[PDB]
């Protein structure tokens, strides 16, 4: 599971990303972020078998990259941290000895969710939509994501969670339902304020 | 270092339909082992990127054949031989020959279909919510296309969200929330409906 931090306008981000032994023996490292609706973009890079580094010029003076040997774990640290900064930061890998093998992207589900505010951190409250077509209110938290599920994973078919608003407060809200024609419980949580709820939905 | 011009950036096609995106390098990125590190990625919503298409024309292994990418020099082609539900998503090609390495900016792939008319739904407020002093009342668009519709409930007191679209329907669902203060504590336009239908 992803994290999810919010930092001030002008401090700076640390991200880490674990991997193993054969990664720092047989890949290149690399740190990716992808903001909110947009395209991925290169940060930087590092050999780990090496210790040399590569950035992307944009952000050549705000981040350093670095990998720790024994622990496998590499790491990010953008500084000045702006509005636009607001992305998902994750690690990704490129083999220093054989062609691209599909197994690049496996970090992804590791990375931050970083988001550059002034607001605070808030839990959300889960409302039911009673009855077809039942579901859960997701509102007033910060910041994003909430994730949401139906009986822990087992309801699939025939469900719309849709991606969060900012309200007139700063707050996001959010809607999930699904159709049936059985119990039906919602899972919420947001990993920035703890909550991790269940709702019955009657 | 190198700029890698995706193009287009985004567009609309039909199941069925070829596809065809290019990425241009604004230099040769052939490297000097005779190799080009050239792949193709795709991004459905929302999870990881995944690889389609390696080094130019490698298809990765288990994807189908109707993706294929060639090209040579600074000029390179993604093509879906025939589309499908299934592969609404952003493309992207990533260039690694030479650091600093580069993604192009993406194509975004949206899928035209039939229009559906949206079946709807209302929800008055929890009863938890209104011990809050908030009343959130809630309309759901289920299921349809294309995206326009219109929805009126009052005015400037309601938002809306509309989902993906669905990677087998290529429909459509779409939120509109009325909240007023507690309390205090719907009527649809749209293409596949000869007639707006309250709710």
């Known amino acids: 599971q992803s994290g999810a931090e919010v930092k001030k306008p002008g401090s700076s981000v640390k991200v880490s990303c674990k991997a193993s032994?054969?990664?720092?023996?047989?890949?290149?490292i690399y740190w990716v972020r992808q903001a909110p609706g947009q395209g991925l973009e290169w940060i930087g890079g590092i050999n780990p078998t090496s210790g040399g580094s590569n950035f992307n010029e944009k952000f050549k003076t705000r981040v350093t990259i670095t990998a720790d040997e024994s622990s496998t774990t590499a790491y990010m640290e953008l500084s000045s941290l702006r509005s636009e900064d607001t992305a998902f930061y994750f690690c990704?890998?490129?083999?220093?000895?054989?062609?691209?093998?599909?197994?690049?992207?496996?970090?992804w589900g590791q990375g931050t969710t970083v988001t550059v505010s002034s607001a605070s951190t808030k839990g959300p409250s889960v409302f039911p939509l009673a009855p077809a077509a039942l579901g859960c209110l997701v509102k007033d938290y910060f910041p994003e994501p909430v994730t949401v599920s139906w009986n822990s994973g087992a309801l699939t078919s025939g469900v719309h969670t849709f991606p969060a608003v900012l309200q007139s407060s700063g707050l996001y809200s959010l809607s999930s339902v699904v159709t049936v024609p059985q119990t039906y419980i919602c899972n919420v949580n947001h990993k920035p304020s703890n909550t991790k709820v269940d709702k019955k939905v009657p | 270092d190198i700029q890698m011009t995706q193009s287009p950036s985004s567009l609309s096609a039909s199941v069925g339909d070829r596809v065809t995106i290019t990425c241009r390098s604004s230099?040769?990125?052939?490297?000097?082992?005779?190799?080009?590190?050239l792949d193709w990625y795709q991004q459905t919503p929302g999870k990881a990127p995944k690889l389609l298409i390696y080094?130019?024309?490698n298809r990765f292994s288990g994807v189908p054949s109707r993706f294929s990418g060639s090209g040579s020099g600074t000029d390179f082609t993604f093509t879906i031989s025939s589309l499908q539900p299934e592969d609404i998503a952003t493309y992207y090609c990533?260039?690694?020959?030479?650091?600093?390495?580069?993604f192009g900016q993406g194509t975004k792939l949206q899928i035209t279909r039939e229009v559906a008319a949206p079946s709807v739904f209302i929800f008055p407020p929890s009863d938890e919510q209104l011990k809050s002093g908030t009343a959130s009342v809630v309309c759901l668009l289920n299921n349809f296309y294309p995206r326009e519709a219109k929805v009126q409930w009052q005015s400037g007191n309601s938002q809306e969200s509309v989902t993906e679209q669905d990677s087998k329907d290529s429909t459509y669902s779409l939120s509109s929330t009325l909240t007023l203060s507690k309390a205090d504590y719907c009527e649809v336009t749209h293409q596949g409906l000869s007639s707006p239908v309250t709710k």
């Open positions: 032994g054969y990664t720092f023996t047989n890949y290149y």
């Open positions: 990704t890998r490129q083999g220093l000895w054989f062609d691209s093998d599909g197994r690049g992207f496996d970090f």
């Open positions: 990533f260039q690694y020959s030479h650091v600093p390495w580069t």
């Open positions: 230099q040769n990125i052939v490297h000097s082992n005779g190799n080009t590190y």
């Open positions: 080094k130019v024309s």
